[PDB]
C-alpha cells in the first residue's frame, strides 16, 4: 500500500502547511547525521550543497571525473518559472495547470503545484549564485517562450542554460566541499543499496580508477542518478547515463513508478553507423521553419537538392493534412520511424528524414534564418559535414527523457524508508509527458527547496548513527557485487557489451518505443530474457576488476538495463491506454493523438520487485484531480 502523504486543504497552501507540520532537526543535531547523495547533477548537486549548508554530513558520489561532468550540463533550453516578468498572464496556478495538462493528467496535483510554486525561488537562487541568465538592455532578466506554453516564462543563459544552472549548483557544492560538510567521491559508481532494518542505511560503490569496492553508511540515502533513457541504445543522453542505482534500489524494495513513461526528441542528428550510440538533439523549433520529406524512390542516388518537388514524398503534409508542418512531436516522430522502417536510405544507415529549409530560406530572409538557427546550423555542419542552407538536414527521433523512475511520495521518499529519489530518477510530477524546461526546474526544486525539509522530517524521527559498515547487510551486498563483477569478467564470450546493448536498444526502440501494441510488446517480453541469457553466457568483458575497466562499467550498466527493459515492456503492455509519451496503437483518436482511459487507468503504476523479473507486483496509486479536471 502506497501512501502519497500529500497534504489536505487548498492546494495553494498545502506545501506551507506540510512545511509547518514536518519535523525539524536542530542545527546542532545536524552534524550527527550522515546523508549519502548518489548523483551530482542539478538535483544531486543542489541537494548536497543545501544539505551541507544545513550542517549535515553529506557523502556525494558521481561516476564522472568531476561533479560538473554530469548530464544536465547539456540542457540547452532554459528553465521555467512562474514569475510573470513578461506580463503575459503567467502565474503559479497557470504553470501548475500547464504541467498537469501537459503530463496528460497522470501525476499527483500537489507535487506539480509545489514544483510550480517553488520555481520562483529557484530562479532567485540561480540569479544570486551568479548564473549569467539573459538580460535585457535595461539590466533586468529576459524571458523567452518554450514549447507547451503560451507565455514567456523561460529563463535562459544563451543556448547552454543547463550548463550554467549546473555550474551554479556545482559552485555551491564546491563551497560546501571546501567547508568540509560535503565529501565528494568522483569516479565512484554506486553498485548496490544496503538496507538495514528496512531502512536505506548505506551504499556499495566501486571506485572506477582503482577498482576498489567500498561500503558507505548513512542515515539517509538520496538517489539523484538521472534517467534510464539509455536502455534504448540510441538516445540523446550522455554515454554514461544508466539505471544501475535506481534498478538496484528497486531490487532492494523501491517501487518503480511508471517505467514505460519515456519521452522522445523529434529533431536529433542521426547516427553515421552502427558504432554511434548518441543522437545530438536540436531545438524542436527547427521544425517550425522546415519541411520533412523523403524521396519517393527508395534507390535515389541523386543529391537531395536535385530531387524535383513532384519526386519528393512530403509526408506529414500528405499525411495529416490538418496541422501540417507542425504536427505534434509524437505523431511526426512515429511517422518518421515508420518511414525509415519501410526502407528509404536517405542517410548512412537509412535512419533519417530530410528536414529541408530551402523553401523557408527562399520565403524568408537567409539572414533572419541565420539569426534563428545559426548555432544549430553550424553544429549540424560540424557534426555531419553538410551545410543545412543548401543540403537538407537529416534528422531522426531519439529517446530523450524518462518520466518514470522510482515512485516517491510527497516527501520525495521511495517505498524504502530513508531512500529519497530526486530529479529524473523518480516518477514524481511529470506525468506521462514532461513539459519543456521542467526537468531542470524539478531537479533544482528537489535539491534546493523540497528535500532539505522532507529529509529533515525523516531524520528528526530517527536516532543518528547506529549502523556501521561492518553489519552483515553490507557484507552480503558487497559479496553480491564482487560475485557479479567476477562473473562479468569471467564469461569471456564472443560478443562485446555494446553489441548486446545495441540489440537490446534496437528491440526496445522497435517495440517499447514510440508506437506500442500488444503483439509487439509480447514479442519484446519474450525476447528480453533471451537477450539477457545470451549476455550472461556470451559477453566479452576484458580487463581486470582492480583497474580502470570501462568495459566493466558498461557491462554492469547493460546487465541492469536488460532487467529494466523487461519491466518497462510489462508496464507498457499493462497500460491499455495512450497518455503523453506512452502511445498504444490500439488506443488513439482518428487524428493519431493519445486517447486516455481515465476511468480505469487514472493512477500511478508502481511496480514491486518480487524476485521474478517477468512477474513484478503492480500497485496502483489512484489519482484524483480537484483543480485541473481531465479533458
Amino acid at each position: 500500500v502506497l501512501d502519497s502523504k500529500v497534504p489536505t486543504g487548498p492546494i495553494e497552501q498545502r506545501w506551507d502547511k506540510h512545511r509547518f507540520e514536518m519535523k525539524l532537526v536542530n542545527p546542532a543535531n545536524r552534524r550527527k547525521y550522515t546523508i549519502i547523495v548518489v548523483g551530482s547533477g542539478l538535483a544531486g548537486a543542489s541537494a548536497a550543497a543545501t544539505l551541507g549548508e544545513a550542517g549535515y554530513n553529506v557523502l556525494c558520489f558521481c561516476y564522472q571525473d568531476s561533479p560538473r561532468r554530469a548530464h544536465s550540463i547539456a540542457a540547452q533550453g532554459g528553465i521555467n518559472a512562474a514569475k510573470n516578468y513578461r506580463n503575459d498572464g503567467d502565474s503559479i496556478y497557470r504553470l501548475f495547470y500547464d504541467t498537469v495538462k501537459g503530463g496528460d493528467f497522470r501525476a499527483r496535483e500537489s507535487n506539480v503545484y509545489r514544483l510550480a510554486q517553488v520555481s520562483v525561488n529557484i530562479i532567485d537562487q540561480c540569479v544570486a549564485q551568479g548564473v549569467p541568465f539573459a538580460r535585457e538592455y535595461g539590466g533586468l532578466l529576459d524571458n523567452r517562450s518554450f514549447g507547451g506554453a503560451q507565455v514567456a516564462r523561460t529563463f535562459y543563459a544563451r543556448g547552454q542554460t543547463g550548463q550554467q544552472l549546473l555550474l551554479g549548483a556545482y559552485q555551491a557544492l564546491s563551497r560546501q566541499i571546501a567547508a568540509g560538510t560535503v565529501k565528494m567521491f568522483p569516479r565512484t559508481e554506486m553498485l548496490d543499496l544496503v538496507v538495514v532494518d528496512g531502512r536505506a542505511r548505506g551504499i556499495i560503490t566501486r571506485d572506477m580508477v582503482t577498482g576498489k569496492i567500498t561500503r558507505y553508511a548513512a542515515d539517509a540515502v538520496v538517489l539523484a542518478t538521472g534517467g534510464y533513457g539509455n536502455v534504448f541504445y540510441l538516445s540523446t543522453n550522455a554515454k554514461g547515463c544508466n539505471a544501475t542505482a535506481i534498478w538496484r534500489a528497486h531490487r532492494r524494495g523501491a517501487f518503480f513508478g511508471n517505467p514505460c513513461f519515456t519521452q522522445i526528441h523529434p529533431t536529433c542528428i542521426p547516427v553515421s553507423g552502427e558504432y554511434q550510440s548518441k543522437l545530438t538533439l536540436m531545438s524542436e523549433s527547427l521544425r517550425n521553419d522546415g519541411r520533412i520529406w523523403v524521396p519517393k524512390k527508395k534507390g535515389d542516388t541523386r543529391r537531395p537538392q536535385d530531387i524535383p518537388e513532384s519526386e519528393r514524398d512530403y509526408y506529414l503534409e500528405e499525411r495529416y493534412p490538418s496541422f501540417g508542418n507542425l504536427v505534434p512531436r509524437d505523431i511526426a516522430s512515429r511517422a518518421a520511424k515508420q518511414v525509415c522502417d519501410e526502407g528509404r536510405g536517405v542517410g548512412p544507415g537509412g535512419l533519417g528524414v530530410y528536414l529541408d529549409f530551402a523553401d523557408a530560406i527562399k520565403r524568408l530572409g537567409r539572414q533572419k534564418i541565420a539569426e534563428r538557427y545559426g548555432n544549430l546550423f553550424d553544429m549540424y555542419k560540424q557534426i555531419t559535414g553538410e551545410d543545412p542552407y543548401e543540403t537538407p538536414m537529416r534528422i531522426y527521433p531519439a529517446v530523450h527523457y524518462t518520466m518514470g523512475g522510482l515512485w516517491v511520495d510527497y516527501n520525495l521518499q521511495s517505498t524504502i524508508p530513508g531512500l529519497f529519489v530526486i530529479g529524473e530518477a523518480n516518477f514524481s510530477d511529470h506525468g506521462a509527458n514532461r513539459l519543456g524546461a521542467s526537468a531542470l526546474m524539478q531537479g533544482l526544486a528537489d535539491g534546493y527547496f523540497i528535500l532539505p525539509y522532507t529529509i529533515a522530517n525523516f531524520l528528526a524521527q530517527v536516532k543518528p548513527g547506529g549502523v556501521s559498515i561492518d553489519r552483515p547487510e553490507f557484507a552480503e551486498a558487497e559479496a553480491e557485487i564482487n560475485q557479479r563483477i567476477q562473473r562479468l569478467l569471467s564469461i569471456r564470450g564472443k560478443r562485446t557489451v555494446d553489441s548486446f546493448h545495441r540489440e537490446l536498444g534496437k528491440l526496445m526502440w522497435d517495440k517499447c518505443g514510440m508506437a506500442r501494441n500488444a503483439a509487439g510488446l509480447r514479442e519484446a517480453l519474450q525476447r528480453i530474457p533471451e537477450i539477457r541469457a545470451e549476455f550472461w553466457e556470451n559477453v566479452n568483458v576484458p580487463g581486470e576488476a582492480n583497474d580502470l575497466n570501462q568495459a566493466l562499467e558498461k557491462a554492469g550498466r547493460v546487465a541492469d538495463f536488460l532487467e529494466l527493459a523487461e519491466l518497462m515492456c510489462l508496464d507498457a503492455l499493462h497500460r491499455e491506454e495512450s497518455c503523453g509519451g506512452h502511445f498504444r496503437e490500439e488506443y488513439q483518436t482518428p487524428d493519431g493523438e493519445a486517447l486516455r482511459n481515465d476511468e480505469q487507468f487514472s493512477y500511478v503504476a508502481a511496480w514491486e520487485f518480487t524476485g521474478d523479473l517477468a512477474k513484478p507486483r503492480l500497485h496502483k496509486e489512484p489519482l484524483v484531480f480537484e483543480y485541473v479536471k481531465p479533458t
Partner: protein
C-alpha cells in the same frame, strides 16, 4: 579512409607508457574521433587486446571530459571544438594521428588517455563561487546586470573545464580556466563581495596544485573549445593587482581529500 593511430598506452599512474600503433583500414569521414576510437576498442576487444581508455560523457562539447591531444593540438586540429566534436573528415586517407593525454604535473595520467583533472575542482573550491546560501536570495530582478556585463560573464562562464588550456600551455598553467571563472564571477554584481579575495585564493590554489605560470603566450586561447579570450586573463590580472593594493592575502589552500 585508412588511418594510422599512434596512441599513448599507460597501464596506470606508476607504469611507464608508450606509443602503440593501430591501423584502421576503414574509417568513415562522418565518424567522430571518439567513435573511431570506439571502433578501434571493439576491434581490440575482439582481438584479445586491452581497449584504449579515454574520458567521455556528453559527446556534445559541453560536459568537458573528452580531453585528447590529437596531432599535437588539444582537442584536435580544428579549433573551437572538443575532441568529441572532431570528426574524421578533418583528416585524410593514409594520415597518421598521434593521440595523447593531457601532459601536466597537476593532471596525473591514470590510464592510456585518461588524466586526473581534480586540480580544477580544487581551484573552484578555493573561492570560485558566490557564498550565497539557499533561501537567502532576493528577488531575481532586484540587482540589474547590464546586457554587456551579462554577455561577457556568459562568455567567460562558458567553460567546460576540459583542461585543454593547461595541456596546450607551454608552462602547464591553468590561467585560462581560473581567469574565466574569475571573470565570470567578477563581471556580475553578485560576485563583488568576494572578488578580490576570490582571485587571490584561486590563483594561489593554481600555484598550490602544481600548475605553471603565465607567459602570455596564448595557446590556451588557441585551443579553447569555447573561445574564452585572453581578456579573461587581463581581467584576472587587474583583479590580482587590485587585491594586492588592498592587502588581500590568500587563505589556506584546499588540500585534497
Amino acid at each position: 579512409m585508412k588511418i594510422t593511430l599512434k596512441i599513448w598506452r599507460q597501464k596506470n599512474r606508476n607504469t611507464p607508457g608508450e606509443f602503440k600503433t593501430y591501423v584502421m583500414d576503414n574509417v568513415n569521414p562522418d565518424m567522430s574521433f571518439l567513435e573511431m576510437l570506439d571502433v578501434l576498442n571493439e576491434d581490440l576487444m575482439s582481438r584479445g587486446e586491452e581497449p584504449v581508455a579515454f574520458d567521455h560523457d556528453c559527446r556534445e562539447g559541453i560536459c568537458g571530459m573528452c580531453s585528447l591531444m590529437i596531432n599535437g593540438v588539444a582537442h584536435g586540429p580544428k579549433n573551437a571544438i572538443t575532441t568529441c566534436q572532431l570528426h574524421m573528415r578533418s583528416f585524410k586517407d593514409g594520415d597518421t594521428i598521434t593521440v595523447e593525454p593531457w601532459r601536466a604535473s597537476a593532471f596525473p595520467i591514470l590510464k592510456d588517455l585518461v588524466v586526473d583533472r581534480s586540480a580544477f575542482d580544487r581551484i573552484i573550491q578555493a573561492g570560485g563561487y558566490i557564498s550565497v546560501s539557499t533561501g537567502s536570495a532576493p528577488d531575481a530582478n532586484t540587482i540589474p546586470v547590464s546586457k554587456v556585463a551579462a554577455d561577457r560573464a556568459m562568455d567567460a562562464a562558458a567553460c567546460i573545464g576540459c583542461g585543454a588550456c593547461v595541456a596546450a600551455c607551454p608552462n602547464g598553467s591553468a590561467m585560462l580556466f581560473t581567469a574565466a571563472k574569475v571573470t565570470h564571477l567578477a563581471l556580475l554584481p553578485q560576485g563583488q563581495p568576494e572578488r578580490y579575495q576570490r582571485v587571490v585564493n584561486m590563483v594561489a590554489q593554481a600555484d598550490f596544485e602544481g600548475f605553471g605560470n603565465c607567459t602570455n603566450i596564448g595557446e590556451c586561447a588557441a585551443v579553447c573549445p569555447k573561445e574564452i579570450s585572453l581578456e579573461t586573463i587581463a581581467q584576472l590580472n587587474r583583479d590580482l593587482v587590485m587585491a594586492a593594493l588592498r592587502g588581500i592575502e590568500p587563505n589556506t589552500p584546499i588540500v585534497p581529500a
